[PDB]
């Protein structure tokens with residue numbers, strides 16, 4: 001068994017390889033998109049994880065696409081996150097903040113000034129996001145057609161990521177995870193399906209990856225490379241964003257570029273919740289030989305699959321999502337081979353303590 005052995009992950013050392021995947025639970029305070037003491041308790045309950053990766057967190061107000069998702073741009077948000085990271089650290093845990101811009105997966109009603117959200121191009125995502133109704137309950141609503149970012153707006157986006165990472169450091173996070181997956185802003189630029197730009201930020205894979213790599217360079221400079229992770233989902237289709245006709249070659253280009261920056265980790269979201277074709281061992285080997293930091297696998301993993309791939313030297317750790325929703329002490333349960341609590345999907349998004357902090361530990 002290798003799941004319960006330590007792993008150096010950039011600036012910190014995880015005592016085990018059972019990581020908590022980033023999970024939007026949409027329970028923040030509005031107005032202000034502010035983390036809450038209840039969120040603090042939820043994360044504290046899970047502090048035995050090798051590493052906690054937080055729910056996706058806005059780099060800016062414009063970044064917002066979901067009602068109830070927290071930010072890390074305002075003083076009030078920084079102060080609230082400080083309490084949450086202190087709680088995790090009080091229990092000898094480690095926590096990374098996942099930072100995103102939702103781009104076109106958003107709605108005008110939650111944008112600054114109530115205006116259209118932004119993206120690489122001006123075509124609708126043709127999906128839904130989650131807002132709140134008049135009583136504060138999560139509701140699904142069709143995405144608003146975006147405006148294409150103007151070329152002179154791109155530096156501001158890079159700066160917003162940079163500033164959010166500065167803020168993450170002050171808030172006491174151990175690492176940051178850039179959300180470059182699942183059809184959100186960075187992935188919108190990466191994918192040819194969502195990027196029809198004719199400037200240097202569209203066309204070739206070099207142009208499509210230009211933005212995410214500018215962001216990686218900015219955040220490594222702001223803090224340190226050993227503090228930076230990135231989540232990608234470069235094979236398959238996610239939230240209507242596929243990865244184009246040369247997805248494998250384009251993925252390896254991006255991974256080679258990321259490797260040059262010497263960042264802490266590469267987190268691969270292998271499938272959407274609806275499923276997809278499995279990664280081949282050949283492709284995993286091609287990834288492994290290009291990236292010289294920690295590789296985290298994710299997507300419907302079992303402990304058995306995690307052990308198999310860690311044992312083969314293809315990944316270093318596994319992030320569990322839904323099992324972590326339902327099992328605060330997932331590490332102890334997997335170590336002891338104990339049964340897991342049943343999941344209650346109706347309370348994954350929005351609401352309060354029920355379905356959030358009421359899954360018991362052993």
Ligand SMILES: Cc1cc2nc3c(=O)[nH]c(=O)nc-3n(C[C@H](O)[C@H](O)[C@H](O)COP(=O)(O)O)c2cc1C
Pocket residue numbers: 021022023024025054055056098179181182231269273298299300301319320321322323348349
């Ligand atoms: C309720 C819920 C919220 C999620 N929120 C995020 C998120 O904020 N960021 C992210 O990268 N992935 C998010 N995902 C994807 C998970 O991180 C994970 O990749 C997915 O649940 C598959 O892994 P699992 O089979 O271990 O649950 C979310 C998944 C669920 C079920």
